Amino acid sequence: APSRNGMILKPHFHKDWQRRVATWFNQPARKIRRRKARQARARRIAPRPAAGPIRPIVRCPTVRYHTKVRAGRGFSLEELRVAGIHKKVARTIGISVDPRRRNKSTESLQANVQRLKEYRSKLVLFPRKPSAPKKGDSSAEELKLATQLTGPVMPIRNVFKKEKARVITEEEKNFKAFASLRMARANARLFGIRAKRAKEAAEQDVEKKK
Amino acid sequence: PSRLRKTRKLRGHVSHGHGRIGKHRKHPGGRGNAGGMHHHRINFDKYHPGYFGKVGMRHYHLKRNQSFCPTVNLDKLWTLVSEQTRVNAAKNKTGAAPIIDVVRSGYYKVLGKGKLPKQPVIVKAKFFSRRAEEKIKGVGGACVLVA
RNA sequence: UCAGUAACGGCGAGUGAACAGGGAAGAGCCCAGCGCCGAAUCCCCGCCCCGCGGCGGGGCGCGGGAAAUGUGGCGUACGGAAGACCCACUCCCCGGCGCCGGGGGGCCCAAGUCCUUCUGAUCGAGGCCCAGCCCGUGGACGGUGUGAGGCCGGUAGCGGCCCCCGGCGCGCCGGGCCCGGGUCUUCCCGGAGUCGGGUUGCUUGGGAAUGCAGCCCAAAGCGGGUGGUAAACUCCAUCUAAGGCUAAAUACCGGCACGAGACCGAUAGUCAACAAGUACCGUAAGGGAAAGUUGAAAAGAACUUUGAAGAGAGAGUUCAAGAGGGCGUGAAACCGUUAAGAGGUAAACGGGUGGGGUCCGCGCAGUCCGCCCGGAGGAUUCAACCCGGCGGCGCGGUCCGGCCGUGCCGGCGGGGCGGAUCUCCCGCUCCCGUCGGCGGGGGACCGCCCCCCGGCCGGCGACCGGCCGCCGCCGGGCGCAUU
RNA sequence: GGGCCCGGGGGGCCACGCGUCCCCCGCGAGCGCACGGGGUCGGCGGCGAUGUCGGCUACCCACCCGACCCGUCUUGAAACACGGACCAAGGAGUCUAACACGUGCGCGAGUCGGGGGCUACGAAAGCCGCCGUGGCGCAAUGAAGGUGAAGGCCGGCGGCGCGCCGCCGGCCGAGGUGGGAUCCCGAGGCCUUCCAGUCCGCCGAGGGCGCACCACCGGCCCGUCUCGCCCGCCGCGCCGG
RNA sequence: UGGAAUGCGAGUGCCUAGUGGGCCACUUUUGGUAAGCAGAACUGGCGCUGCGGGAUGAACCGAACGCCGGGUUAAGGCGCC
RNA sequence: GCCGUCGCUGGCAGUCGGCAGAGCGAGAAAGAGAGUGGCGCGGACGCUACGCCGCGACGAGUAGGAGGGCCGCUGCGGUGAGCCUUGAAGCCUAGGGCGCGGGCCCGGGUGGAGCCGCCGCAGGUGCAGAUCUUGGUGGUAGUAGCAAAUAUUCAAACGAGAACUUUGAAGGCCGAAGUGGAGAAGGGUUCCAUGUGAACAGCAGUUGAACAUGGGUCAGUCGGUCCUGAGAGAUGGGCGAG
RNA sequence: CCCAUAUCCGCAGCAGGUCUCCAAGGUGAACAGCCUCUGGCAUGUUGGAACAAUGUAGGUAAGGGAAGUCGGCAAGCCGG
RNA sequence: UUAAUUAAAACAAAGCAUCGCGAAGGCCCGCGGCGGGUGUUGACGCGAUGUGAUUUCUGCCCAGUGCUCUGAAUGUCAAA
RNA sequence: UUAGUGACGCGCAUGAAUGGAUGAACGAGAUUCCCACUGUCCCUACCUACUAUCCAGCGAAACCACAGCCAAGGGAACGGGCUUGGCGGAAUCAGCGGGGAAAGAAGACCCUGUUGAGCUUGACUCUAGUCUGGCACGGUGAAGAGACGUUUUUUCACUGA
RNA sequence: GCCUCACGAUCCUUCUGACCUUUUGGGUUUUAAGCAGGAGGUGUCAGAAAAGUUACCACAGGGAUAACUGGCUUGUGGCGG
RNA sequence: UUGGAUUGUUCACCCACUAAUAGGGAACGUGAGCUGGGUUUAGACCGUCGUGAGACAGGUUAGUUUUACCCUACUGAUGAU
């Protein structure tokens, strides 16, 4: 029964919730198990980077996050094509490929193409047969220095373009941001109806004319 | 801890703090929010006006990312840049104003609560309030709209 | 995390996801179809070589069958194929054979039973020269007549030895493949009683209907589906259904094998610490207990005697049977006996005394202490001075040296951190060899901090030494007695 | 009777220096007793080793006064109301979640690593910082589209005709009234041989700045209503302010 | 001259349990023949509360309670118990 | 007089000592002020400030709330150079005491191996009740009772022991729809021999269907076995998520 | 082997329940009741001594004859 | 016939009288079917009710509620 | 003679297969009277057996706050306890049924509960079954009537489902 | 309406109102949903959607509550002035 | 302060005798004293009522009556000071 002032509460405990309680006492054990598998995986694939294949740069969807870039799933076939990397060869040298992803704009495309060219420049490639090097294999002098890389490959960061202070021009002072904003909403709101009214008037005037 | 609680003090006192007459019974009055329009009506009306009924339009598949618009008032505007940014601009003679990009700080709309220092500034933002634009213009600043 | 949110709901009670974002993990693929290849494909039998406890590899059969009602190779929406032209190619796998570098099992690896001593027995107590019994990468735990690092098993150790299994490498034999990229030219390209629609029932947060199903209707090919309010028109965006495979991160009150615990401690904890899913009940489905402990060691009481015997009396073992085989301790209720007291208003009870007991005071000539007076004695004998040590304090009116200021000033000071403060080197890239942009770097500047040097003030009471002075204390001298 | 029991011609006074001017007519010493800020004696006596001394309470007994059986529901229980023959052991407000307020601690317009990752006790603890995603807080309001939190003065001009509106440049600036802990000033005053005049303190009428908080009055933001005149332009609008 | 007497330190905010069967008496009072009946007002009680008195008794009369010594009382008493 | 509560939001850091000077309770604001001119070596206690001290008033209590427990129980981190086989826990006690109380300390006895104080942490933490659970024991009480179906007696034997066993003899009963002789179902060794007389056989027993130690069930022909009965039940088929 | 006032089921050696076969003499209509032979048993989970009340189960009653009681319940009468 | 408080006047019964049905049927079972019972049946039968031997009789009421029969003549009337 | 029987009948509220009236035989069915009989009674007595009884052996259970003499009082309005009186003397045996508002079983009666269940129906909401229409399986051919070679409908046939 | 009575939440439906908002990738148009105000009604009138019977009965309780006795009262009954 | 017929009856009425045939309480005395006729379970019939299941201070018939050995009281029996 309610008693004086308070909040009205609706706990979701009307089922057999005690039959499905998930405790977390195995949490330290999971952390050790996952860590022990990261290490055993890093040893297995050494000297390949422990983090995994290089990932592209992508912009997060929606207006809440489109100011941020993060690691994608894989490089697009257009990005790989522009960088001259065969799509089936890309995975064999630690490049992640995403055939689903599209490139709508050039800047994002060229950002990931430079990424692939920079990664290709840091790639140390061991010959398939150690004793018999081949055309693209790295020289022996840089194979000695090859060491496993920790952390994501070429980590992705959000870098802001610092704009230095500048004298404000009379044209910026005279700009009306709020009036511009309010009129932009109104024009978008009334665009369809205005054209419909305009079209009828043309027909309305034409019928009298002819 | 159980040693600091009433039960330890209620040993030997028969009823245990629930009375000899009314006793502690299972669920008098109902369970949960029962009776809201009935024997519990005074409590609900007195403390929860508006609780019963419906108001306004429904919206299916609401996506709260579409209405994302963090706001900042003008009185906190200069905290988005460094302290030396303000003093260097204040004391410089060429008249160059620093650019404050609120979107970089994580805000979209600029609001007008507060008073600005007497110092020109260029403010970039997706949105402005009317009073924010005038206060920014009153100090010799300029509003810049970004997308 | 979104989020108890959008939504659902006698819009009551109640119910209730997703996307984005951050992480764990990360892996992608294959058909039918459309085509081209002389079915180029597959199964089985018989013989020869190899292997043979995962039945396979090669060779030979005018051996048998499957399969044109479609097997195999290429190829699948990320497009693919054929041709031409440029460019580039020798390692990739299968079946055998040989050689070189984690898992399971077995055995083993430090130091006191030292000297006294308590005990039934001890692992107890005391000691073990300077220095501090000995070892210690081992002081987890268990056992042993307490209570043990050193008595035994163990424990520690990138300790040792011996078996087997595996993994990773390197060569030989017999096979299979005769393998790719780019630019052009010409071609090819898809899953139907399914989608979709109506209606019914269920289901969902899914609301003019989220998913599923039945019945009816029943497709198209610039089509189809989705685009969270029914519908027409119109642009857009985004996928490509009705075929298929796929590790990892996730789950795990059963099973095998282990480790631990601020848990319970025999009416507890599993029903079950034990011949417990037992005994027992029910025709059956089913239901289902109680029940741990002698002692260090059986040394488990020989023998004598009364009795028909059970039982007793002695005797003996043991530290103890005042531990005697349902035996550790051994409570209360209840009972016997012994002792004391008492007794016709049931007993019991509160207050106040009195009498009598049991024991206690380990009582019964009655306290202790400071100073002072007097009588008898006796001395590691007092003060005052001298030597030495230590300590306290000092405005030493203002001594020297130190560290040092979460103080202030002066520096060609030698540096770290940070900055939404400014700006000669290079990587990629647009354009002509030029010239602009993204990204990576000096340098300057500002703030703070650390270390170096000079000047003031300043602490050493969370932070001190040397001299000097005063005072106190201690040790040793001298004082040898009206102290 | 009242006038320090007004003025004149045997018994008690908390009268008892003096130079005076004149209304009127600043410290003696001792000594002692006490109806004096709560009891002392600087007063005494008997008894004591085998039967005596002290021992509240406790064991038993007696007597006088008191005295109904507890728990429970109940207006009312000793009840002819229910449970309780007796003893032991067990036996009932817990833990999870959510919320509210109070308190304690940390940091503070921020705060929180809880998920993840790194590096015997230890499944601990330590760390991350371009792991702060994210939660809560920092902004409200409207069903929503959306909007989203002080002004005045000076000078100049345009319009209406000293006052009003619009646009331009300079100066001040987050309201006021009442109360209000505390703080601030200070008229005057805080003694010793007597005067002047100081330094440090100290008290204080009156007067001030006024914390928090409360009441009241203004203001600002969003919804809505009434009235009304203007201002803007890449879109001249069923536009925007 | 803080503008009658008297007494007394006040104001304010959060959180909050139990209760929500009552019953009795003086006076007033409704229904009822009346009831130790039913139903109201006022105040005080009992409930929650012992204690002296009414022999005995929820409510009557006196008086309210820490553990004590002395004194004195209230209401009631003083043939004997 | 004493105890506690509340109030004075009372007092005490001044234990300021021979680098000394003892006071600030008193009717009535503010200095035991500072200056400039005119022999002995001595002096109690205190102050866990969460402490200590003073003065005044007050003290009923169900339901209910709150505080304080140097009240009590179990375990955990610290600490007590803690206790303990020269005796732990537990238990008992007309022994001595402390505290308003919850309780606790010590003495004596038994016991035989572990236990406690303090600062913190934690909780399956405190019983008189619930026709509470489980176990034990009372009075009732040597009581109700050991009364359905006619019945026993004499002698001897064994034996420690005889109303009840065995033998003999009497007197009786069932009275061939039996208290006789054999089976089915059910039991499952109860059957037979020998032994025992602990427990059981509601007295006793020398006895038993008890206990113990050993034996005992023989088939072509007697049954099962085979047949079909009422019925049950696969396959084919049908239905069905299964 | 028991086959049931002790071998089975009713918690038991429980006056209950539990399917069958054989079947003597006398009296008598008779597989009635009563007595006996063959066969069996020991009085039904104890004995001794008394002979009060009240019982349970059997009897008998002068004179009356249902007056008793709700009612002839019970007993009695009749009986081959 | 109410095992274990009712043995009866209750139930049944022969008799009597109604009702459905000629098998693709009546009545009934069954989650289900080319399922099943009546039924190895066929109206002198099967199924469903009432009354209750014999004797004698069984009167009036079709408004109500039921049951039943006729229906494009025809108001309302679902989906398609 | 509140009984029985026979009559009467404006019958609270008799009556015709919800069967009315009757009637032999039958009944562990209900009722009245008469003969006979008797201990049912007047009005009780005596006798037998088995108990009870006492003894030896053996031996429970129900129940129990503490208990156990009364009058009155007041009191939860009927006390074993309390107040005032009457009074009170160990330990026991056989009986007894006044009391313990004795035991037995959380009253079946009655009410309350937003507790049920069996049953009923003109309760509310449904539901198997059943009747009915449509769509599908679902076809072949002649005629009749419609509508614009096709198409709806009626009748008559066909067979192959 | 001379005054003191003459009446009705949420949800839902229906009507009226705006150059109204939304109708979810945009635009037009139907539709639908919003916003404000009326009405449709709950008379158990602060507003469930609702017939019986039980003697075949059940459980939790109740001396809060009827059927005996007892208690107060004594109208009625009885008895007496 | 009586014996009887009718009634379960209390009550009533009548017959008969008698001195008289008075009235009452004791938990409307008295069911571990009986009986069980009535009332008041479950079976069943009739009438009235109800669509019905069922109901009826309306008739009718059939329908289990438990325990004392405790305490007291009482009756007797030993005994006790």
Ligand SMILES: [Mg+2]
């Ligand atoms: Mg409440």
Ligand SMILES: [Mg+2]
């Ligand atoms: Mg209390």
Ligand SMILES: [Mg+2]
């Ligand atoms: Mg409480």
Ligand SMILES: [Mg+2]
């Ligand atoms: Mg209670």
Ligand SMILES: [Mg+2]
């Ligand atoms: Mg309550």
Ligand SMILES: [Mg+2]
């Ligand atoms: Mg209540």
Ligand SMILES: [Mg+2]
């Ligand atoms: Mg509760």
Ligand SMILES: [Mg+2]
């Ligand atoms: Mg939230």
Ligand SMILES: [Mg+2]
């Ligand atoms: Mg759900």
Ligand SMILES: [Mg+2]
């Ligand atoms: Mg996501």
Ligand SMILES: [Mg+2]
């Ligand atoms: Mg990852």
Ligand SMILES: [Mg+2]
């Ligand atoms: Mg193909």
Ligand SMILES: [Mg+2]
């Ligand atoms: Mg695809």
Ligand SMILES: [Mg+2]
């Ligand atoms: Mg060793």
Ligand SMILES: [Mg+2]
């Ligand atoms: Mg030693």
Ligand SMILES: [Mg+2]
């Ligand atoms: Mg050891």
